Amino acid sequence: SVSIYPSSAEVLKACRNLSNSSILLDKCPPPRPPSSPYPPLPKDKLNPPTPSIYLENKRDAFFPPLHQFCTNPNNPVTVIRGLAGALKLDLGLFSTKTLVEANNEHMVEVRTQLLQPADENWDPTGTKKIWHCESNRSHTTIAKYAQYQASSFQESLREPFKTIKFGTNIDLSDDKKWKLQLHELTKLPAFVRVVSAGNLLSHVGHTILGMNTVQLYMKVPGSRTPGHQENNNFCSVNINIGPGDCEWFVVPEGYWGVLNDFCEKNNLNFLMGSWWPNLEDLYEANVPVYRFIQRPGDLVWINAGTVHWVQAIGWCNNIAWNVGPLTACQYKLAVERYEWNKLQSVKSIVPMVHLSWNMARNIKVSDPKLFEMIKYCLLRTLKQCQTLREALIAAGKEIIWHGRTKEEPAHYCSICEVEVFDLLFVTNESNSRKTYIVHCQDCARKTSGNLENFVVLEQYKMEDLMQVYDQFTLAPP
Numbered sequence: 001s002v003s004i005y006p007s008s009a010e011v012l013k014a015c016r017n018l019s020n021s022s023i024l025l026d027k028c029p030p031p032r033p034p035s036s037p038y039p040p041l042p043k044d045k046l047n048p049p050t051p052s053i054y055l056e057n058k059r060d061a062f063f064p065p066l067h068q069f070c071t072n073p074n075n076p077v078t079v080i081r082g083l084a085g086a087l088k089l090d091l092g093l094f095s096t097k098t099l100v101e102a103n104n105e106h107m108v109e110v111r112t113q114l115l116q117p118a119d120e121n122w123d124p125t126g127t128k129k130i131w132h133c134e135s136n137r138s139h140t141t142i143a144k145y146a147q148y149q150a151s152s153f154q155e156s157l158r159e160p161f162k163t164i165k166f167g168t169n170i171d172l173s174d175d176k177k178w179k180l181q182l183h184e185l186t187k188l189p190a191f192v193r194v195v196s197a198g199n200l201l202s203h204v205g206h207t208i209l210g211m212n213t214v215q216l217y218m219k220v221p222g223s224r225t226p227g228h229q230e231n232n233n234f235c236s237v238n239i240n241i242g243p244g245d246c247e248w249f250v251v252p253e254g255y256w257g258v259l260n261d262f263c264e265k266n267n268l269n270f271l272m273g274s275w276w277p278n279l280e281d282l283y284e285a286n287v288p289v290y291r292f293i294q295r296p297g298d299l300v301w302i303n304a305g306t307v308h309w310v311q312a313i314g315w316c317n318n319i320a321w322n323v324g325p326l327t328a329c330q331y332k333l334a335v336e337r338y339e340w341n342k343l344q345s346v347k348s349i350v351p352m353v354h355l356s357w358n359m360a361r362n363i364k365v366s367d368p369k370l371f372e373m374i375k376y377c378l379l380r381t382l383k384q385c386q387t388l389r390e391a392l393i394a395a396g397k398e399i400i401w402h403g404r405t406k407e408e409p410a411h412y413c414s415i416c417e418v419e420v421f422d423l424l425f426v427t428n429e430s431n432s433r434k435t436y437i438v439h440c441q442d443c444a445r446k447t448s449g450n451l452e453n454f455v456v457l458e459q460y461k462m463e464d465l466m467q468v469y470d471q472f473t474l475a476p477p
């Protein structure tokens with residue numbers, strides 16, 4: 001166990017001395033979208049079968065190799081067949097009828113869409129296949145969406161596209177409204193649980209809605225979730241409640257640069273836009289597509305960075321959340337997309353700096369590659385904080401001890417939405433109002449070169465950070 005990182009004292013001494021030798025190369029290669037993977041795949045390998053686990057007994061679910069099979073980078077997606085039945089999960093707790101009985105006034109975000117044929121997406125005139133996926137936002141209650149979902153089923157029983165409505169992003173975070181639902185999910189094995197010691201998102205220290213909390217989706221046939229990677233490339237878990245089936249389309253992480261280019265050529269934003277890929281385009285470009293059906297009770301594991309899009313075939317509900325395996329692969333993909341998001345001016349829903357410092361306090365990391373990635377992160381941010389701190393003092397500006405409360409979330413810049421760690425810039429008016437509306441350093445200087453209109457709040461004792469950094473060391477196996 002040879003340590004390759006400077007001590008916190010050494011970092012601090014190097015930040016004071018403004019001649020000397022360097023600690024590290026501050027410059028760093030900026031992120032970019034990858035080129036199409038090498039080696040390329042021939043046409044006969046562009047429709048690969050889906051990695052599948054066939055569960056029969058509760059015991060099968062707790063088999064340790066299941067974990068490694070799902071996180072294997074070579075498996076972009078895994079369908080765990082018969083999960084609900086092997087664990088005797090009561091999916092009825094998530095039926096529309098049960099949900100209405102429990103919280104009939106609960107909010108539902110509604111996406112109004114066009115009912116498209118099979119795997120295709122046509123412009124609204126039925127004239128040509130396009131990538132843009134019309135999906136307009138409104139809001140309703142569980143009671144009113146339940147009513148639509150049920151009558152929709154009745155019209156079909158009886159006997160230029162039809163408009164449909166998709167009930168999405170239903171917040172199941174409140175354990176006093178959903179106690180029975182959330183308790184049922186504690187029956188799952190650790191590696192897919194919402195909360196776990198082995199789940200990086202359980203170390204964020206606060207709620208990230210829909211990632212470390214459960215979301216529900218209420219669907220009618222044709223309800224589409226457009227193409228996306230998960231927030232900061234975290235893995236995802238999804239269970240179909242039924243009674244109908246869902247159809248999944250999946251592209252390996254390695255190809256997201258190719259899909260980003262398809263989005264740009266089609267005048268769409270990869271990260272933030274609404275797009276449904278044309279499968280003939282993907283085929284022509286040698287992009288492999290995993291396509292499969294998720295039945296009621298089947299669990300779908302979306303591996304880190306997997307590009308995917310989904311549509312209901314029948315009437316069904318789904319539940320979903322994110323997990324973060326404690327692996328070098330997952331941490332690396334999360335930090336890369338954290339960096340890419342900054343370049344793109346897209347908010348990182350997972351505050352990777354805040355989270356890395358929490359990981360360093362709480363987790364004994366025994367894998368060298370993961371450990372080095374985390375400590376490198378601590379080093380870069382520790383150095384950034386002490387460098388900023390020095391420049392402020394040397395400029396006469398004062399640093400107000402602000403501290404932070406139990407579970408205080410990470411703060412972001414109200415202008416560019418970057419994470420702002422440790423040193424917060426707020427205007428004097430937002431200071432007194434205790435709206436504490438945070439800016440990053442760059443956005444503050446844009447409105448006040450000398451920071452006259454700004455106070456600087458400090459969240460952590462530098463000595464606290466220096467100690468967490470020095471006590472984060474490679475754990476024994």
Ligand SMILES: O=C(O)c1ccc(O)c2ncccc12
Binds near residue numbers: 302310
């Ligand atoms: O509609 C779904 O079942 C779904 C499946 C997989 C996902 O990653 C989602 N992300 C956001 C909203 C819905 C979904």
Ligand SMILES: [Mn+2]
Binds near residue numbers: 228229230236
């Ligand atoms: Mn998703």
Ligand SMILES: [Zn+2]
Binds near residue numbers: 413418439
């Ligand atoms: Zn900013």
